Every structure is written in C-alpha cells, then in structure tokens.
Amino acid sequence: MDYRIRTSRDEDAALLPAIERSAGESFRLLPELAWIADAGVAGVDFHRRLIERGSHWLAEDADGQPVGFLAAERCADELHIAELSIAQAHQQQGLGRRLLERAVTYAHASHCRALTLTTFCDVPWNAPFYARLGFQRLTWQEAGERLRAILGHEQEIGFAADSRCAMRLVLG
Ligand SMILES: CC(=O)SCCNC(=O)CCNC(=O)[C@H](O)C(C)(C)COP(=O)(O)OP(=O)(O)OC[C@H]1O[C@@H](n2cnc3c(N)ncnc32)[C@H](O)[C@@H]1OP(=O)(O)O
Ligand SMILES: [Cl-]
Ligand code: NA
Ligand code: NA
Ligand code: NA
C-alpha cells in the first residue's frame, strides 16, 4: 500500500496522458465544470520536453507503475507548476502533497525564488488545498505578465475568468 516518488524518465512519458485523463474524472460531479473531464490533456512531446529539463516527477505504486505526476517548468527565476494529476484510483492517499513537496525541494536546490500555478478558486482540491501549503492568491496586477497571459488564454478555451486565479509560493 506504499508509493514512491521519483524523477520521470523518457520511457514514462507515453503513460502520462492516461493518468491526466483519469485524474480529470473527479470533475464529472461538479455540474459547472463537468466538461473538464473530457478536455484535452498534454501530449507526450510536452512531457518529454520537461523530463529533459529534469523538472518532472511521478508517483509509482508498489509494482513500479506510474499513478500520478507533477510537470514543472523553470521560467526566469520561478518554477511554474504546469500540471499535477493523480489517477482516480490513487487519489486521497497523500501523493499530491508528496509530489508538491518534491517540486519545492527542487525549486530550492535550483535557486528558484518562487513557485507559481493557475487553478480553480472554489474547487476544494485546487486553490484551498494549495493555500494551506502557503500558495497565495494573486490579484490581476500581482500576477505579472506571464501568468496574466495564461489566465487570458484560459478564458478563451472554456474557463470563466471569475472562477480562476494565479497563485505564488515565495521561498523566503
Ligand atoms: C496547477 C494544477 O495542476 S491545478 C490541477 C490539479 N489537478 C486536478 O485538479 C486534477 C484532479 N485532481 C487530482 O488529480 C488530485 O486530486 C490532486 C492532484 C489535486 C490532489 O492529489 P491527491 O493525491 O488526491 O491529494 P492528497 O491525497 O495529498 O490530498 C491533499 C489535500 O487535498 C484534499 N482533497 C483531495 N481530493 C479531494 C476531494 N475530492 N474533495 C475534497 N478534498 C480533497 C485532501 O483532503 C487533502 O487535504 P488535507 O491535507 O486537509 O487532508
Ligand atoms: Cl459546480
Ligand atoms: Na473523454
Ligand atoms: Na492539464
Ligand atoms: Na535565483
């Protein structure tokens, strides 16, 4: 009943879209957001690009099969958390927290000033969860140009501006 966190490798990339698809099944019982469950997921090219940079981790079960991942990208002096997904059958076992812990340890080791993300404000496993870990909700102005651009494009593909926010965890 134990899991391990490790760096992702190139051979793992092909397995990751199915994990992101499985993770999104949690949105089918939110009526306003149920469409998310059949939204796109990142392709293998995206994962391979970040695995080459080294900023990509996964959780594996006792048989070594990947069951969740965290894909991140260094952007200037910040580590941006692009996607964090745990497969449905392995949610609520602590793995999301453990992958975030790994990402922040890597951000500190690589001399990043802060971590960033964008997410839903009022989904219980999104912004409220991240806030308990120290991520701060940003105003539009505090978001800065890079995160503002993401939020703007999100509004073109289905997200409602009033339901999304950028967040930052500053490493003191
Ligand atoms: C920047 C981004 O990537 S935002 C996108 C996030 N990804 C998604 O929303 C996809 C669907 N969700 C998931 O994949 C997972 O639920 C994750 C990654 C959000 C969380 O990973 P998990 O392994 O389930 O999280 P973990 O078991 O560590 O739980 C962490 C906290 O989330 C809470 N939580 C997790 N799932 C739920 C749920 N369905 N309902 C309410 N609370 C939940 C837990 O209660 C826990 O809080 P606690 O410390 O008060 O107990
Ligand atoms: Cl809803
Ligand atoms: Na689908
Ligand atoms: Na995604
Ligand atoms: Na730095």
Swiss-Prot record:
One of its GO terms (molecular function) is acyltransferase activity, transferring groups other than amino-acyl groups. InterPro entries: Acyl_CoA_acyltransferase, GNAT_dom. Its EC number is 2.3.1.-. CDD domains: NAT_SF (cd04301). Transmembrane segments: none annotated. PROSITE patterns: GNAT (PS51186). Keywords: Acyltransferase, Transferase. Residues 3-162 form the N-acetyltransferase domain. CoA binds at L84, S85, I86, P128, F129, Y130. Catalyzes the transfer of an acetyl group from acetyl coenzyme A (AcCoA) to an acceptor substrate and releases both CoA and the acetylated product. It can use a variety of substrates including spermidine, spermine and N(8)-acetylspermidine, 7-aminocephalosporanic acid, colistin and thiamine. This is Acetyltransferase PA2271. It comes from Pseudomonas aeruginosa (strain ATCC 15692 / DSM 22644 / CIP 104116 / JCM 14847 / LMG 12228 / 1C / PRS 101 / PAO1). The lineage of its organism: Bacteria, Pseudomonadati, Pseudomonadota, Gammaproteobacteria, Pseudomonadales.
